[PDB]
Design a protein around this ligand. Structure first.
Ligand code: NA
Length: 129
């Protein structure tokens, strides 16, 4: 599924991401835009042999099992393919564990490089939330 901006804002909010660990909804929408372009099916191979899966490009090195990431963990206890679903429940559930790990949203390098400190509220502008 390729989500609309406000569509994704609405879904993330329903699943309790808005102001989760103090990160306004606009931060989560901004992260998703630069990680996945709002595409639930997005997959990207990392140089270390791990893969990033779904709207928030959750990494097989730590968070989900894909069977092909040697020496990795599955700390969200899901197959990585669960993170490609048109239903974001699993991606949100897992992102809550990632952003709780101690470095907040810096875990998403594209959030640090492209969203951090910016006008993130623009991403939810015009949305009926
Ligand atoms: Na893994």
């Amino acid at each position: 599924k390729v989500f609309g901006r406000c569509e994704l804002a609405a879904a993330m909010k329903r699943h309790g991401l808005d102001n989760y660990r103090g990160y306004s909804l606009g931060n989560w929408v901004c992260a998703a835009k630069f990680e996945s372009n709002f595409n639930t099916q997005a997959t990207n191979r990392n140089t270390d042999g791990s893969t990033d899966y779904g709207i928030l490009q959750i990494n097989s090195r730590w968070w989900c099992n894909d069977g092909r990431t040697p020496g990795s963990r599955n700390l969200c206890n899901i197959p990585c393919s669960a993170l490609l679903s048109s239903d974001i429940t699993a991606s949100v559930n897992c992102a809550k564990k990632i952003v709780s790990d101690g470095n907040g949203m810096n875990a998403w390098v594209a959030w640090r490089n492209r969203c951090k400190g910016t006008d993130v509220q623009a991403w939810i502008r015009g949305c009926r939330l």
